[PDB]
Design a protein around this nucleic acid. Structure first.
Length: 319
DNA sequence: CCGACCGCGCATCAGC
DNA sequence: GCTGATGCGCG
DNA sequence: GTCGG
């Protein structure tokens, strides 16, 4: 409906973040693009959009110019500037942030090919990001997710039956396609007052059956890496998977949190306020304005009960 | 007018 | 070698 | 860049 405007804003956001290294402007722009995309009328002026939360005076000028001229002068000058367009592109490589990008580009490294020539100048995460540059930008069709979940839940169940695993993200809301695979893991012998190699044991199994192919980073609670579905002798693209081990007594707060949507938790985090509780990523604690101890949570329903809110199916949690 | 705008786990580096 | 800072990715 | 205290 307003495809141009939201593209323009998203270009602007990518540029403040990657090139100006001004992350707050980056979120301001995308915030603005977020609300404008969710606007059931074709915007007809800057002023019109100004009535929106997240759209201020400056973005309003840009919308008038884009509407009037079909382009934005600021963006043009930016696209025809090799430095900032080459820094902006390099960040598409996982492991290359604003700072690394600019660094490379200062010393001539501008392209994927320049990166291959210089593999010896990238860290491990970066090498892997370079390797799977195309694959990481692909979306994961649901029926692959489904198939991926099956192996992950299946291989966890096989290390120790007490393991609990939940693939969250938009996928848990039944979105047709995901961007990565986010699994939350926990285990009875693991609380806020508590085994030695719980995550490891599971990452290994998944490696042992050739499902996990590369590790970006791995510690006692968070795993970031790459996986791939087996094929029938045209191989599947490689995909990003995170795996997070969480204490059992905060597990379900976790699940609720990493299921979103961002907006659903917003209207919930800030509805539980009305009713006298503070929800966060870890716990639901009561308010006295001082927060008491965390309450027991045995499921997602429990959290919904505390704020006496009707339970909302992950699917219907779009907002 | 002026500061907030999430803040955390892991990898790596800067400074001893 | 150790400790704290920084970069990066991510709900 | 936009917001709200």
């Amino acid at each position: 409906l307003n495809g141009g405007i939201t593209d323009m804003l998203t270009e602007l956001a990518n540029f403040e973040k990657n090139v100006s290294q001004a992350i707050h402007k980056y979120n301001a722009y995308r915030k603005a693009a977020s609300v404008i995309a969710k606007y059931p009328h074709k915007i007809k002026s800057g002023a019109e959009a100004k009535k929106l939360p997240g759209v201020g005076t400056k973005i309003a000028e840009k919308i008038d110019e884009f509407l009037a001229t079909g382009k934005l002068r600021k963006l043009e000058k930016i696209r025809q500037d090799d430095t900032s367009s080459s820094i902006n592109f390099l960040t598409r490589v996982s492991g290359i942030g604003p700072s690394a990008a600019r660094k490379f580009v200062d010393e001539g490294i501008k392209t994927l090919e320049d990166l291959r020539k210089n593999e010896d100048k990238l860290n491990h995460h970066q090498r892997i990001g370079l390797k799977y540059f195309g694959d990481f930008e692909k979306r994961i069709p649901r029926e692959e997710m489904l198939q991926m979940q099956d192996i992950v839940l299946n291989e966890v169940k096989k290390v120790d039956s007490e393991y609990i695993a939940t693939v969250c993200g938009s996928f848990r809301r039944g979105a047709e396609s995901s961007g990565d695979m986010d699994v939350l893991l926990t285990h009875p012998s693991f609380t806020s007052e508590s085994q030695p190699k719980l995550l490891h044991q599971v990452v290994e199994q998944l490696q042992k059956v050739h499902f996990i192919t590369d590790t970006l980073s791995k510690g006692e609670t968070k795993f970031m890496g790459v996986c791939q579905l087996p094929s029938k002798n045209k191989e599947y693209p490689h995909r990003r998977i995170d795996i997070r081990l969480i204490p059992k007594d905060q597990y379900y707060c976790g699940v609720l949190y990493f299921t979103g949507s961002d907006i659903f938790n917003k209207n919930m985090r800030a509805h539980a306020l009305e009713k006298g509780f503070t929800i966060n990523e870890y716990t639901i604690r009561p308010l006295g304005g001082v927060a008491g101890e965390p309450l027991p949570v045995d499921s997602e329903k429990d959290i919904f009960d505390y704020i006496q809110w009707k339970y909302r199916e992950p699917k219907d949690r779009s907002e």
